[PDB]
Amino acid sequence: TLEKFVDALPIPDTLKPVQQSKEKTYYEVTMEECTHQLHRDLPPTRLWGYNGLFPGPTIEVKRNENVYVKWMNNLPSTHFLPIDHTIHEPEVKTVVHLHGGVTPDDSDGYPEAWFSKDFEQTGPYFKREVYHYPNQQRGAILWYHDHAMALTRLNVYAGLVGAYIIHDPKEKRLKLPSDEYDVPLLITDRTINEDGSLFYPSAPENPSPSLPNPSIVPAFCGETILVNGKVWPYLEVEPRKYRFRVINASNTRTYNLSLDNGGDFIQIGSDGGLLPRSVKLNSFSLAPAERYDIIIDFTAYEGESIILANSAGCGGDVNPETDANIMQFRVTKPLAQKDESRKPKYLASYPERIQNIRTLKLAGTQDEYGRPVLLLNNKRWHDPVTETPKVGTTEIWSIINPTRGTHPIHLHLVSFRVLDRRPFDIARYQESGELSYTGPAVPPPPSEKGWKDTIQAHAGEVLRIAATFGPYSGRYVWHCHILEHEDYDMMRPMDITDP
Ligand SMILES: [Cl-]
Ligand SMILES: [Cl-]
Ligand SMILES: [Cl-]
Ligand SMILES: [Cu+2]
Ligand SMILES: [Cu+2]
Ligand SMILES: [Cu+2]
Ligand SMILES: [Cu+2]
Ligand SMILES: [Mg+2]
Ligand SMILES: [Mg+2]
Structure with a gap:
């Protein structure tokens, strides 16, 4: 195997804006096929990279910096990794999600707002070439990555990831x-x-x-x-x-x-x-x-x-x-x-009233070929939306996991607080649908006493989180962030509604 510790750690350069004023910052980033050596002893690897770099450039912004990014696809029209045509048009589709961004819905990188090479063909929710990130949120480590419908696991693995720091x-x-x-x-x-x-x-x-x-x-x-x-x-x-x-x-x-x-x-x-x-x-x-x-x-x-x-x-x-x-x-x-x-x-220092509670089961089915399909609350991605919290309200989501593994559940737009986890009898739950606990509630460790957006829902436990849904309304998603699960089919739309 490859000899460990013979390559110095690259530090991605910080992306420079195309234009910056005291009131707006504009970036352009192109997705390009490129070649980079991943180890001293290897020939260069074919990769897909933001600005032809893997990882992509680090983007550094201030809190409340009014940022626009034009994300462009300059990739080839065929993928180099294996595409399964049975799980869900141009073969190569891309869209960039700022993971953790408090972002208007039309800039969030919705999986069906994808675009092919040079925006030649676009998905049903495609609306804008230039994304807007107002960055009206706490300083944090964010990151950006591809989020195209049914291709996320491939486009990310190909190299479409980068860090985004809010200072x-x-x-x-x-x-x-x-x-x-x-x-x-x-x-x-x-x-x-x-x-x-x-x-x-x-x-x-x-x-x-x-x-x-x-x-x-x-x-x-x-x-x-x-x-x-x-x-x-x-x-x-x-x-x-x-x-x-x-x-x-x-x-x-x-x-x-x-x-x-x-x-x-x-x-x-x-x-x-x-x-x-x-x-x-x-x-x-x-x-x-x-x-x-x-x-x-x-x-x-x-x-x-x-x-x-x-x-x-x-x-x-x-x-x-x-x-x-x-x-x-x-x-x-x-x-x-x-x-x-x-x-x-x-x-x-972080200081409330709960308007609604929601129970969500991590479920499975088998497809016509016998393969496991992972589901959120036994629904499919294209089922009518069911997670429809009202803007400005706080909910408790109880995420029940009867599967054998951990799922890292991510909600777009928001961050949330962890309330507790509690183990339950899987068999009982599976036959009856009744929750019976095998032990006391485990309150969150100190690592999880602040704000999370991606949270480990362990096997045989009920995880409860509390989220305030805003500041924006519109159409977002939530999903497991194991990309192989996300793509088939552990992702659902999430509508934050406003009357
Ligand atoms: Cl220092
Ligand atoms: Cl709000
Ligand atoms: Cl671990
Ligand atoms: Cu993500
Ligand atoms: Cu996200
Ligand atoms: Cu999962
Ligand atoms: Cu996502
Ligand atoms: Mg440097
Ligand atoms: Mg079933």
Whole structure:
């Protein structure tokens, strides 16, 4: 397998605007097929990248910065990965979603607002070439990625992911590490052929002769882990505090991260911005689309090499020589100036009436070919909309998971608070539809006491979340963020209504 830790960690450059005034910022980003080497010892890999880069450029904005992005497709008219024509027109369709954006519905990247090459053909909900992001929200780590109907798992795996950071000037008072000591880490697992080409499966394990070819698969676990577009890279760091913006941009894989020297992470932020209080952690779970804003303090580790290790299995136990590793920190860079950054415990203050409660079951069916189809509340993507909360109101969603696995559930537009999780008897529930609890409520850990947009709904548990639906009304979605589930068919429209 590929030799670990021989490539330096790329730091994506920060995108420069086409035009900027004190009241509006305009960006243009083109999706291009490109070639990049993913490891020292590989030929360059064919990729699809925002501005021909993988990951895409990091976009940095301020809170309330009035931003417009013209996202353009300059990709070829055929895909290089296997398309299953049975799960749901040009073959290649794209649309960009700003994950976590508090975004008007026509700029949110609705899966059926897709466009082909040069906007030549467009989906039924296509309305505008230039997206508007008012950024009227808390400072946070966001990210952008492809969201095209039934192609998301392919377009993302091809390389269409990038970080988007919202900076709230008020948070400067905290003196958190910044500028060159504030580094995004976009983690993607991939399987790469000896010739450098990406591998994505064209059929699952099931040997049924019925299956289409290609056929969608239920989950993808990559052989190799990349960070910022390089396999098992190293980052040289000074002996001081750094801020890392940690993004799981993988299709299916969940990571459980630790430092191999026993050092701790200080978590300062979750998907929806800073936590109320920082949390000292020896390890944390990071499912697809979750973000952790962390400080690592290398001050006491001068000279050390420190592995960012993974203990979570994906289709089996981790292999210590491969997916047990993420990247390596080398604390060998000479300290360039005194570290004036801080790691305050007390970060933010967040103070309500519940207007409605909603019960949602994570369900399955089998399709005509015998393949598993994953569903939200036993409905299909194209069923009439059922999640129709009113604008300005707060609901509790009780998400019941009787399946055997965890699903990272994401709601667009909003962030929400976690109330509790509670285990239930699956068999009982499955025969009767009655909830019977096998233990007490588990209140959220400190990591989940702030604002989330993507949340792990564990097997055999009821997860309750509380969300206020706004500020905008219109047509959004919610879905599992395992992309293989999302595409078939664990995604539903969500209408925030306004009389
Ligand atoms: Cl700093
Ligand atoms: Cl985990
Ligand atoms: Cl609101
Ligand atoms: Cu997303
Ligand atoms: Cu999203
Ligand atoms: Cu799922
Ligand atoms: Cu989405
Ligand atoms: Mg740079
Ligand atoms: Mg059924």
